[PDB]
Amino acid sequence: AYVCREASISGEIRYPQGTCPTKTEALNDCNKVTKGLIDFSQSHQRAWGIDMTAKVQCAPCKTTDPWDVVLCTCKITAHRYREFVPKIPYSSFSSAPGVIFRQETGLDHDPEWVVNMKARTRGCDHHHHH
Length: 130
What we know:
Shape: elongated
Domain Avirulence Effector AvrLm4-7: 19-90
Protein name: Avirulence Effector AvrLm4-7 domain-containing protein
PDB class: protein binding
Distance between the termini: 16 Å
Number of strands: 5
Keywords: alpha-beta protein, Aviraulence protein, protein binding
Keywords: Signal
């Protein structure tokens, strides 16, 4: 009888010195995270649901500079995230498989689930036809 919410988590993925990923590659890595969190959610009473989708945003590469480190920002959104279930800290999944994004340059707290209060509540289970 519970209702769920949309929630997001953002994190940073850094690429090797002197390299430059395609946008497709960056999003692909970011979807490894997505897949990671789905497995963790799944083996934790579906705290976050199974419906997750990722977008990513990178800094331009510096074709001139040979040291440049490309910082990608990876944003995962859980569409059926459980507010009533206690929040799960980054400390509990920073090492889970696929979970390769880290704390963001410039920020002083770690990546964290942020519930979107503006968005409407939805059911926690997805009905394909109902």
